[PDB]
Amino acid sequence: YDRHITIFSPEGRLYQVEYAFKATNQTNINSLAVRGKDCTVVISQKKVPDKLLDPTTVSYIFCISRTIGMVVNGPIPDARNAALRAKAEAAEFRYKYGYDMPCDVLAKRMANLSQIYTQRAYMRPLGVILTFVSVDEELGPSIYKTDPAGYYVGYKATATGPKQQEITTNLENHFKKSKIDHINEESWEKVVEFAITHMIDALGTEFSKNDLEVGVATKDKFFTLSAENIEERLVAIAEQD
Amino acid sequence: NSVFSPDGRNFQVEYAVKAVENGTTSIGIKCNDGVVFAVEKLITSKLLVPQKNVKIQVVDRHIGCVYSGLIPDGRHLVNRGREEAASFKKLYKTPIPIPAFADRLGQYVQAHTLYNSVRPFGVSTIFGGVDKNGAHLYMLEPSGSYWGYKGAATGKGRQSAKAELEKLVDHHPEGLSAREAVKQAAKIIYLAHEDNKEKDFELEISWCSLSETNGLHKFVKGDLLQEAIDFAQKEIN
Amino acid sequence: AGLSFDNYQRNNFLAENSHTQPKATSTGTTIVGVKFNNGVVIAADTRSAKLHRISPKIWCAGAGTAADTEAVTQLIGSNIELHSLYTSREPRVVSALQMLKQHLFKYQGHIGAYLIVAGVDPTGSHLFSIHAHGSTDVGYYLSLGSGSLAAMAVLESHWKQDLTKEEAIKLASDAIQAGIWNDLGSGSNVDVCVMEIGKDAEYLRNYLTTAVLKESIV
Amino acid sequence: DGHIFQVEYALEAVKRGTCAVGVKGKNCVVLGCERRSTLKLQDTRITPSKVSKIDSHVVLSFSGLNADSRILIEKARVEAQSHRLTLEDPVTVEYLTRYVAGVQQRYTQSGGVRPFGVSTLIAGFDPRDDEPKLYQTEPSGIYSSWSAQTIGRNSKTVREFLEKNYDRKEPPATVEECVKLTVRSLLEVVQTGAKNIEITVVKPDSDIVALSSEEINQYVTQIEQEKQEQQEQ
Amino acid sequence: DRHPLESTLKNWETTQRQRQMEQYRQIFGIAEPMKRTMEMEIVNRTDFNPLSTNGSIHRDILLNKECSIDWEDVYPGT
Amino acid sequence: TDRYSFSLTTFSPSGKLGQIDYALTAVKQGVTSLGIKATNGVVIATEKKSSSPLAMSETLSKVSLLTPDIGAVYSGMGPDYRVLVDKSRKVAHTSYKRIYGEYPPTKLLVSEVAKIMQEATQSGGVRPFGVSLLIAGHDEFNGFSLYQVDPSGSYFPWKATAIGKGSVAAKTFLEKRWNDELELEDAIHIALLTLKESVEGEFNGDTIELAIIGDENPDLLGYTGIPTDKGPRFRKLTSQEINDRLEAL
Amino acid sequence: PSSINGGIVVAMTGKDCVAIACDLVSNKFEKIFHYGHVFLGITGLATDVTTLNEMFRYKTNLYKLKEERAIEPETFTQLVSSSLYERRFGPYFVGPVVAGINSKSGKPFIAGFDLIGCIDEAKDFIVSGTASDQLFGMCESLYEPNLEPEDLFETISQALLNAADRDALSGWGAVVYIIKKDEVVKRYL
Amino acid sequence: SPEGRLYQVEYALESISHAGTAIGIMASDGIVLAAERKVTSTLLEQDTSTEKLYKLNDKIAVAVAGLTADAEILINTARIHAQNYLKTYNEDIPVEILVRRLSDIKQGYTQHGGLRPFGVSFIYAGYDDRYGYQLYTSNPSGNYTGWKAISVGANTSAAQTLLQMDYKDDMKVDDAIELALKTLSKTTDSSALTYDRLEFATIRKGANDGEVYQKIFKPQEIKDILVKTGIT
Amino acid sequence: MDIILGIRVQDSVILASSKDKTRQLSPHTLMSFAGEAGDTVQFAEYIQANIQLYSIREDYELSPQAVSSFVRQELAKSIRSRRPYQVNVLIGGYDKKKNKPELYQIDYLGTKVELPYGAHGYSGFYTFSLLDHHYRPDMTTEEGLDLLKLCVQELEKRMPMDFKGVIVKIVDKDGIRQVDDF
């Protein structure tokens, strides 16, 4: 009974949650996010290498209402279900309180729902880590990450997936050195190229318009890139250095 | 009712997919402006009423379904698909986009994979249609996990069938026209039955194409089916 | 649960059978609000307390049934304190406006609170008024209650863009005191508060044969 | 849904609860019971009655769990008074037995609740009737009508003794001889004697009587010298 | 006869959830309201203990009342 | 033998509840938090050992303000603490403040919190909350207090306590230090010393969270002119005021 | 109690003291209840006067059990104000007049309410009852700030004696409670 | 549960058997309750906290052996019923009506599937006019028994031995104090006894003016009964 | 009309009513009432059902005060909603702990008084001037019946309607006694 339901084990553990955490490595996808000066940028390794699939239908970047969006990793069904829970709450906070749902409160609100499934017996945790990004009217560029236990924290930059230790070490060694606590560029054209550069450094593989998914937040909108805009940013890295 | 495992895998989905592996084999082709659905039957007896018997279900004027797994589970999804797409008409006053239909069924099937009191649907569906963007084709699993596709196949015959679906799409860089797919799909279903040919089965094919069906779903009958059989028979011979 | 109607058919019967009912306290007398160069001002008349706080930076002036103005403002003052604590951001005047509009629309004028809402938040400065219907109004200056025609008439005559603190506090006081020169000798003084966009909200109070001896201890 | 063993096991707790016997008479009904030892320091002046009124004309006693017994007596009391309030005549002894059977069967039918560890005797007269009524209900929600019955600890040896001294065609001839048989029945089992016997006697139209420690002594020092006279014989 | 708003507010909370779920059906399809009502069924079914009167802490997260008061949360009818 | 339906936290054969001891083991594994009552105020304290070096560790406030004059801190399940604290803030406004116009005493509000922990142990199908809470605060008549609450919903008043990982080394230090004289200034210094024994990361104004329910603070009320209102007794030590006091160590 | 909405209460404050009177002696339909040191004069329907007595006895006994201290006049003022507002739509037909001494400061307190719980706090005197307009005229003619305990009794008793002066015997009553920090009294004048 | 025997309720009766010790003794003039607080650390505050003894109204008190978290929910449920009885009947709740209501709630958690039983045994003291002074006990099974002198919790049987060999039907309340304290000092396996480790309450007739008078003790009165009784 | 009359002497209460219309709540307590022909009978029986349920459940008599306060509570609790209907209740009992006869009147709004003698019915205006001159705390039961016979004769002198036949009942240490003027 100690491993089938979310109840304290002999060592004070919850094994159901450790199993929802292993579901977050299931897709073999890595995602990366960085704050700029006026933007926040998120990358995901699209990875459809060997199939009859239709890549304009395989995605893990979900926009939430207007100015907010997220990358999910973990199984695609639980990712879409988490997106449904994230778009309904941003839409009804905007009804109740008369202003646009701030990302900090959406991350808290998704983390508190995950505390239900983390205490109840008859409900299962979602097997996903949710990485919310936006540019707030107060705190500016924002990253917040939520996990199957209902824990959440804001970030300067973050990585999630099988290879997150590599990406996080390369990010840390950059912020440790430039000492700004964000990527110091005035436009999203240079923060996507920093993000793709440091992702290609960490995975050990170069990227194409077929290995990449990219989303950008700026204070007017969250927008996913099309594969032709990723093509400009690949041509621009290759041209620069 | 048993809901996570040491691999982070949903135990009751490990069981519910075993039914798909024992269901009737089927193929869907996304043609250059349409979808073609094709299937192998299980004629255990002549008692099976021909014509009355059908595997490819109408979900809406522009949408169809073929599925492998437990029959009441799939019948319930076809019934919920008929409710779902009709709910779109009754508010948005237009036919539903196929990716919206596919997401609504993915969210529906995923719902039962959560709680320790309901069953993961033991059925894989291939579904698709033609809409204001064009043709679309999607395959949905017992896990809830679905995605778009150039062509797909599922049920008993899946490995020989998927080897032939690659031999379509690697061989033609555009894929294929709706009237070519009617021939080419039948080649696969009689080929993938190689390990069961000590029993016989009926070919059934249906389609929707913006040109060849006016963008409305129709069955493939008579001379086209007979020409596809005369193709599939010369190709397997 | 909640606000009950327990004695609704009994009190209609008691009032029908001549047992004439106690009278609720009605504040009919003027409230004004005046937006200015760096903030907002609101003020009200007193006779025998009419300014209520939703949050340190968001204040109401009340008119109509006095217990309803104190009850709804402090209920929304609880929801907004809880919402400020829940979100960890300073509360917004537009949140107060939505909560009051939604709440007075739960009721249907049954609750008789008439309300001028003014404040500051991380967006800037704001000034609105809610009626018992759940109707809303917005403006650079507003008034409600019995002095409202005379107080608005003065506010149009004197208001400017770039109006400063001392000018606005004079004008709010003259806009009330025109509304008290009409029927003068009944009330006096003016409660005013001033919400400077960078600073604490500032509140100014009154700104002008031996009978029977049977006994026991209890 | 539980499992049926739970009903057999409930009934094993009923066997470890103290003895209770009831008998019909020609013109009365009696219930009587093995009242446990009152422990030293237990308060005499309020000591539990073991037999309980449901109204003036229905009376009940149990074996098994004394906690579960409160709840069935109190579900029965509220049904009796709510019935009189809603239907303008007092509850019949069989209707009360059908309501107690209804709740006992409800806890035996539901898998989310244990069934009561309580069997009961239920006795009385119907309103305006002089046929004495007697019943027996069980953890299973089953019930039956009786002339004489016993439940609880050693109840088989009392059933032996009743089959050796009572006749369905010819009850103990009048309310005095009900007491002789029922006291002598309990004296087969209650080895500490007249402290441990408790008896309550009911007659047509709402007369109900608790016999004191003095009358049960008068019956025990009547049955005892009849035993001596039979030993000298 | 009766107070005008007596029944208007009697059914209010269920009337509001009913209307919220009807919009979720219309916009997000059949699955989303079914998911919400299943969680509500699990939380009403499981958390029965007779002495409870604060409802449950988890239904406040599902109803989205986790930091907001009605007069009905100030005055339980009891 | 148990087998008794789906009931959780059931009685083992030795009479232990069992599930709750594993919740105390979750509490015992969590990062230390502690508090001290002085003569003129109370202190509450904890450590924010980081969940990533790229995190904004200002977004996870481990110390929370239940109401003006009342605060809190914990060890164990952070999600469980946060939900108990959204309910604790709500129940103070509903049951007490909206009837009586005052905020509830610490004795009252600790019973309200402990009730939710007790009722999550008697219902089926919910594990205990894996947290121990400290609550500190002030009231007109009762004066100042510190409380501890365990997963069971048992609670008690303390003079000083420490919960979570370091708690035996912290409680031997607190008995060796606590005295009836204490001024709030020296109490903050004893709290800073005690977390500096228990810390495994770096110690600075970013890795320690520390607060105090002491004097009234009218500069924090956010408004002036009503004479009576006292000013929330809230002085959560920001990282600079902490680094000023860490100059002493 | 008949013509019962005519029942009156005068409340008044003096140097470290208070005084709540009410017409009756008849010692019938008494309307000045004590909940520890706090006194609640009630005026209006005798059914609501006694319903409210039981209701505040319930709430105060629970308060005293829960909180381990008696209810202070301010907290009783808030409790009666919120509790009367719970009946917003069919209110109690009353004007309560709370009184006592705030036990921590030693200060006098009085307040009155309207039927939905609005608080009148006045630092001199308070009146309630449907025809007491005459008695407000009386009391404003004769109050003086900071009166001593026995002269407080003299002024509140002269307020009462000047009211309704057709018959001062048989149907005349005035229960002058005088409320101080240690001992409270009840004169049946 | 199995073989005609309750297993969880037998484990709840075992759960109370660690839970400190509590005695109650009745006398012709009134009732004594006394109890031992289990916890001791210099940092746990010894004034203000009722650990064991609780008022339900003036005339009725309860002593707890068991989980205090469990006890407090039942105590509040009885306080509501006692004031709701007083609001209904204008007269103080008879002690039996209260101990029956709490005993039924404790049977309800014993039978219901989802619910563990409450791990608390209560001794009740109170006065009412039906029987005068009454002393009762109510265990985790929901059964209740009336007693002249009783104990619950740790060393139940050893304490009931000393009550049985010292008690008399006609003593007054001052004689019960020395026996209840000496019963505790003979029942404390904890090494020695102190004014902070005790809790005490008495219910008495007072002025005979229809009074009932509970005497909530302090660290000053309990110190005095210790040195008066024979420990210093 | 349907007059009720109640008179309290040293050691009895005498309850009287026009020609049913009383309940023995306990063998030491009564409740003669008057009002609208429907709801008063359901209220009288609902009161008898709970008071009798307590009487069974404890085997203990609830005091005349405590049933009087119960009756005022259930009347208030059923005046909420619906609308006030015309009813009056006299509770006449004997208290066996205090050794006193007791008489409470409760009008339809829930106003509970305790007075020497009480009536409901508009011809009651005749009786109060007759009962102010003779009422005495020291009276014995037969002085009670003598007061009553004066009242019924003057009620009859002033009522040519069907006022014939009061039903009269006495409550004391010996319980309910039904008794005659005749």
CATH number for the domain that contains residue D11: 3.60.20.10
Q: Which CATH superfamily is domain C29-218 in?
A: Aminohydrolase, N-terminal nucleophile (Ntn) domain (3.60.20.10)
Query: What's the token pair of residue G1?
Result: 């109690």
Burial of E54 (0-12, 13-18, 19+ CB in 10 A): middle
Residues of D in contact with I45 (CB under 8 A): 85
For residue B126, give Cα distances in angstroms to B21, B59, D38.
14, 12, 78
Domain that holds residue G52: 1-189
Q: How far is C40 from chain E (nearest CA, A)?
A: 27
Q: What is the DSSP letter of D41?
A: T
d(CA H48, CA D140): 51
Contact check, Cβ <8 Å, G47/I113: no
CA dihedral D138, D140, D143, D148 (to 10 degrees): -30
Beta strands in chain C (DSSP E): 26-27, 31-36, 39-46, 51-55, 58-65, 113-121, 124-130, 136-138, 141-144, 188-196, 201-204, 215-217
d(CA H146, CA H166): 19
CA dihedral C158, C159, C164, C165 (to 10 degrees): 80
Contact between chain G and chain D (3 or more Cβ pairs less than 8 Å apart): no
For chain G, the domain total comes to 1
Q: Do the strands H30-36 and B135-140 form a parallel or antiparallel pair, or are they unpaired?
A: unpaired
Backbone angles phi and psi of G64, in degrees to 5: -60, -40
Bridge partners, residue I33, by sequence: I89
The neighbours of chain E, by the rule of 3 or more Cβ pairs under 8 Å, are A, B, C, F, G, H
With b meaning 16 or more CB within 10 Å and e meaning fewer, what string describes I62-88? bbbbbbbbbbbbbbbebbebeebeebb
Whether the CB-CB separation of F131 and F84 falls below 8 Å is answered with yes
DSSP string, B88-127: HHHHHSSPPPHHHHHHHHHHHHHHTTTSTTS----EEEEE
User: What CATH number was assigned to the domain covering residues F1-248?
Assistant: 3.60.20.10
CA atoms within 13 A on the CB side of C210: 4
d(CA B141, CA A199): 32
Query: What's the token pair of residue B139?
Result: 């395959």
Whether the CB-CB separation of B106 and A77 falls below 8 Å is answered with yes
d(CA B80, CA B95): 16
Residue indicated by tokens 């201290």: G69
Bridge partners, residue B204, by sequence: B39
Q: Which of C25, C27, C29, C46 is catalytic?
A: C29
Residue of F nearest to C201 (CA): F223
Contact check, Cβ <8 Å, G1/I76: no
Measured between CB atoms, does G61 come within 8 Å of chain H? Answer: yes
The neighbours of chain B, by the rule of 3 or more Cβ pairs under 8 Å, are A, E
Q: How far is H37 from chain F (nearest CA, A)?
A: 12
> Count of CB contacts below 8 A, C vs F?
40
Residue of H nearest to G50 (CA): H87
Task: Based on the residue annotation, tell me whether C29 is a catalytic residue of this protein.
Answer: yes
Residues of G in contact with E3 (CB under 8 A): 89-90
Task: Check the CA dihedral D72-D75-D76-D77 and report its sign.
Answer: positive
d(CA I91, CA I102): 8
Residues 6+ apart with CB under 8 A from I91: I25, I29, I30, I31, I64, I67, I68, I71, I102, I103, I104, I106
Smallest CA-to-CA distance from G92 within G115, G114, G59 is with G115
Bridge partners, residue I170, by sequence: I14, I177
Bridge partners, residue G39, by sequence: G34, G99
Whether the CB-CB separation of D16 and D9 falls below 8 Å is answered with no
Contact check, Cβ <8 Å, I110/G50: yes
d(CA H215, CA I2): 54
Contact check, Cβ <8 Å, I111/G51: no
Q: Which residues of B are catalytic?
A: 24
Domains of chain I: 1-182 (3.60.20.10)
Smallest CA-to-CA distance from I149 within I32, I33, I1, I5 is with I5
Backbone angles phi and psi of A119, in degrees to 5: -115, -45
Task: Check the CA dihedral F112-F116-F121-F127 and report its sign.
Answer: negative
Residues of E in contact with B83 (CB under 8 A): 30
d(CA A80, CA B144): 10
Residue of I nearest to G28 (CA): I113
For residue H129, give Cα distances in angstroms to A99, I27, I173.
64, 20, 18
Helix (H, G, I), strand (E, B) or coil at B79: helix
Residue indicated by tokens 């951001």: C89
Polymer length in residues for chain B: 237
Residues of C in contact with E67 (CB under 8 A): 79, 82-83, 85-86
Whether the CB-CB separation of E70 and C2 falls below 8 Å is answered with yes
Count of other CB atoms within 10 angstroms of residue C182: 14
> Count of CB contacts below 8 A, A vs B?
83
User: What CATH number was assigned to the domain covering residues B1-237?
Assistant: 3.60.20.10
Domain ranges for chain F: 1-248
Whether the CB-CB separation of B14 and B6 falls below 8 Å is answered with no
User: What CATH number was assigned to the domain covering residues A1-240?
Assistant: 3.60.20.10
d(CA B52, CA B61): 20
d(CA D79, CA B189): 71
Domain ranges for chain A: 1-240
Whether the CB-CB separation of G32 and G20 falls below 8 Å is answered with yes
Report the Cα–Cα distance between both ends of chain E, in Å, rounded.
Answer: 25
Residues 6+ apart with CB under 8 A from B49: none
Backbone angles phi and psi of A118, in degrees to 5: -90, -15
For chain E, the domain total comes to 1
Query: Mutual orientation of helices B178-192 and B158-169 as an angle, nearest 10°?
Result: 150
Query: Of F11, F16, F145, which has the smallest distance from its Cβ to H8's Cβ?
Result: F11
CA atoms within 13 A on the CB side of E10: 9
Q: Do the strands F223-224 and C201-204 form a parallel or antiparallel pair, or are they unpaired?
A: parallel
Residue of H nearest to G69 (CA): H48
Task: Check the CA dihedral A75-A80-A82-A83 and report its sign.
Answer: positive
Query: What's the token pair of residue G30?
Result: 């008494």
Q: Do the strands G119-120 and G108-113 form a parallel or antiparallel pair, or are they unpaired?
A: antiparallel
Contact check, Cβ <8 Å, F123/E46: yes
Domain that holds residue E37: 7-74
Residues 6+ apart with CB under 8 A from H134: D43, D46, H26, H31, H95, H96, H124, H125, H126, H127, H128, H146
Smallest CA-to-CA distance from F113 within F96, F94, F135, F97 is with F135
Count of other CB atoms within 10 angstroms of residue G145: 9
Whether the CB-CB separation of B135 and B62 falls below 8 Å is answered with no
Helix (H, G, I), strand (E, B) or coil at D11: helix
Q: What is the DSSP letter of I168?
A: E
Q: Do the strands D148-151 and C188-196 form a parallel or antiparallel pair, or are they unpaired?
A: unpaired
Of the candidate CATH numbers 3.90.1150.10, 2.130.10.10, 3.40.50.1970, 3.60.20.10, the domain formed by H1-232 belongs to 3.60.20.10
Whether the CB-CB separation of H16 and H154 falls below 8 Å is answered with no
Smallest CA-to-CA distance from I64 within I116, I120, I108, I103 is with I103
